[PDB]
Design an enzyme around this catalytic site. Structure first.
Site, short mmCIF file in Angstrom:
data_model
loop_
_atom_site.label_atom_id
_atom_site.label_comp_id
_atom_site.label_asym_id
_atom_site.label_seq_id
_atom_site.Cartn_x
_atom_site.Cartn_y
_atom_site.Cartn_z
N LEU B 84 8.69 -2.17 -4.09
CA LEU B 84 7.36 -1.66 -3.93
C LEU B 84 6.96 -1.14 -5.29
O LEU B 84 7.73 -0.42 -5.92
CB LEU B 84 7.37 -0.49 -2.95
N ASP B 85 5.77 -1.51 -5.76
CA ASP B 85 5.24 -0.96 -7.00
C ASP B 85 5.17 0.58 -6.93
O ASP B 85 5.11 1.15 -5.83
CB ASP B 85 3.87 -1.57 -7.30
N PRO B 86 5.20 1.26 -8.10
CA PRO B 86 5.22 2.73 -8.13
C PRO B 86 4.20 3.44 -7.23
O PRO B 86 4.52 4.46 -6.62
CB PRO B 86 4.94 3.04 -9.60
N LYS B 87 2.99 2.90 -7.13
CA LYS B 87 1.94 3.57 -6.35
C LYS B 87 2.01 3.20 -4.86
O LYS B 87 1.38 3.86 -4.04
CB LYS B 87 0.54 3.25 -6.91
N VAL B 88 2.78 2.17 -4.52
CA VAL B 88 2.88 1.68 -3.13
C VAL B 88 3.85 2.55 -2.32
O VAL B 88 4.92 2.92 -2.82
CB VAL B 88 3.31 0.20 -3.10
#
Lengths: 92, 335, 48
Positions: B84-88
């Site tokens: 998951l990307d950092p903001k996800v």
């Protein structure tokens, strides 16, 4: 200036300075493939490719002096034969 | 008690749930007190065969998050179910120690997201968002955000809500591993003419686990270790960590006799004399799970015989090990 | 953040942008609280 140009896209609408087209070719264009009018004047190059397998769309990054907003629905855009890939290149 | 006796099971846990529906090759086996039913593993082996259904918070990377869990648990190895990307936020399956052998399957599995797209202008016809979302279901062209054009499938999607004044749409999507919601959002914007990007994103299912399946937070993990360290009560750790067998519940099963478990682990083949019970509907080359009579996952395997053959065959290889999960010497060697 | 939710009758999340549902329920953030590994509040959290 290619000898022959092939039907590639039909104008859908502008999107934030780009032209959006529905593909009218069975093949997939190269990224940055020059895109032409029927009379072979270059108006831009292929930017984004998108959509489902049976209805591809692509965007044109307009060249100098070309405005996306100047075209109308169904206006056709063209591509060189040597800038197309068979769809099977992207499938298993 | 949840061990198949050497002689209604819908409440039996995990891989033994509804085991009475498995066809019977042999009614008897000589039991061996090696190993443990997954829920009854001693703390150390419970954690080392453990998985955490983690609700990843927004900002840290998946790698950062998995490092934090390793430090908290003071375990040997961690791995996860797909970046998951950092903001996800949302479902990140963190595998501990031996459960790490299942990482590859988790990463290649389908995913579900709830996503907010931010459109760059109001739509005239508000219904156009749902139409364009439907247009963008199926096998889609996506260039990843050195980057080659590829095809990834969105299996299904659904527009949940759209505020055309706030320029925000929230939708759900079920997709193939490697489908980028970021790119979908851009594409929605292009199809709509107004333009768009991804406002925010949450993963609501990662393969075998959804956010409804005992999802816990990093605070839960820290607190569970704290309670054990300070009071030596195992219950919080046991509540937040699930057996790796949880990830295998969809698989058709073959139960191996205790005396054949070690041999499977070493030789990578299950033979007829080692066969106890087997699922209906197993076809040749189906991916299956081999399990002990106590419901422990021995290995993911490739069926070398159909269910019907398993009934009529007197000899031969029933399955071939694809990935061995159980520690090789958990069960004793016959020689 | 904008993603909100409430629980449906099945215990599963219903997602929404609204801060209050049609039913009058105050919606919760879909995203979990920020975590930093130096968090001091285990004792308080566990006893509460």
């Amino acid at each position: 200036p290619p000898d022959t140009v092939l039907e590639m896209g039909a104008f859908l609408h502008p999107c934030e300075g780009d032209i959006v087209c529905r593909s009218i070719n069975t093949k997939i264009p190269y990224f940055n493939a020059p895109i032409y009018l029927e009379n072979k004047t270059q108006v831009g190059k292929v930017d984004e490719i998108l959509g489902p397998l049976n209805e591809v769309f692509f965007t044109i990054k307009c060249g100098d002096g070309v405005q996306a907003t100047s075209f109308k629905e169904g206006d056709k855009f063209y591509i060189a034969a040597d800038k197309l890939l068979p769809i099977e290149r992207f499938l298993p | 008690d949840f061990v198949i006796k050497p002689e209604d099971t819908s409440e039996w846990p995990l891989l033994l749930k509804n085991f009475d529906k498995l066809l019977v090759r042999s009614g008897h086996y000589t039991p061996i007190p090696a190993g443990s039913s997954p829920l009854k593993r001693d703390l150390k082996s419970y954690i080392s065969s453990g998985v955490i259904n983690l609700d990843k918070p927004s900002n840290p990377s998946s790698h950062e998050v998995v490092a934090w869990i390793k430090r908290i648990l003071r375990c040997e190895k961690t791995g996860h179910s797909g970046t998951l990307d950092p903001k996800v936020t949302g479902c990140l399956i963190v595998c501990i120690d031996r459960a790490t052998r299942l990482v590859k399957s988790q990463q290649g599995a389908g995913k579900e997201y709830v996503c907010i797209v931010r459109l760059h202008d109001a739509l005239k016809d508000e219904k156009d968002l749902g139409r364009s979302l439907e247009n963008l279901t199926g096998a889609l062209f996506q260039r990843p955000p050195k980057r080659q054009l590829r095809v990834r499938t969105i299996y299904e999607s659904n527009l949940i809500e759209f505020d055309n004044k706030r320029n925000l749409g929230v939708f759900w999507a079920s997709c193939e591993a490697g489908t980028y919601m970021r790119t979908l959002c851009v594409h929605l914007g292009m199809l709509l003419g107004v333009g768009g990007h991804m406002q925010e994103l949450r993963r609501v299912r990662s393969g075998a686990l959804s956010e409804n399946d005992n999802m816990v937070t990093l605070h839960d993990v820290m607190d569970a270790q704290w309670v054990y360290d300070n009071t030596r009560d195992e219950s919080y750790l046991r509540s937040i960590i699930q057996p790796l067998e949880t990830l295998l519940v969809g698989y058709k099963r073959i139960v191996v006799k205790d005396s054949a478990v070690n041999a499977v682990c070493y030789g990578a083949k299950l033979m007829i004399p080692g066969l106890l019970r087997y699922e209906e509907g197993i076809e040749l080359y189906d991916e299956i799970v081999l399990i002990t009579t106590k419901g422990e996952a021995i290995a993911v395997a490739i069926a070398q015989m159909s269910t019907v053959d398993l009934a009529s065959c007197d000899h031969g290889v029933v399955a071939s090990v694809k990935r061995c999960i159980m520690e090789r010497d958990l069960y004793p060697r016959r020689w | 953040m904008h993603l909100m939710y409430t629980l449906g009758p099945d215990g599963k999340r219903i997602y929404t942008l609204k801060k209050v549902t049609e039913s009058g329920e105050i919606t919760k953030s879909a995203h979990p609280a920020r975590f930093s590994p130096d968090d001091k509040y285990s004792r308080q959290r566990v006893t509460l």
